[PDB]
A paper describes a structure:
STIL/Ana2, which can then interact with and recruit Sas-6.
HsPB3 and HsCCD form a complex. heterodimer, i.e. a 2:2 complex (coloured chains).
Author numbering:
A (entry chain D): 729 to 750
B (entry chain A): 886 to 963
Write the structure that this text describes.
Amino acid sequence: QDRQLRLLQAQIQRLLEAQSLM
Amino acid sequence: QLLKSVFVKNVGWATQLTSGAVWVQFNDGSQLVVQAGVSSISYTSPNGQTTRYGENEKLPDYIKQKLQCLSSILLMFS
């Protein structure tokens, strides 16, 4: 399921950007 | 429930589940579980202790390292 994997990639990237802003 | 498990040297094993989640077994004995639809991440220490973190919590450094390595692993799958 490449769709769910792509959504997961975007999720992890957003989480990492948010964590960088802490 | 399980899909193809991939071995990544110097890191460990990465597995994709039918639910759309990814489960990583690191070579240091720790585990990490993430899911596309869920707003939390699960981390298991080498001692078998599990801790769930939310998206709005400041994560420990090592959790962020493993999330970075996981991001690289997902990148190489393309």
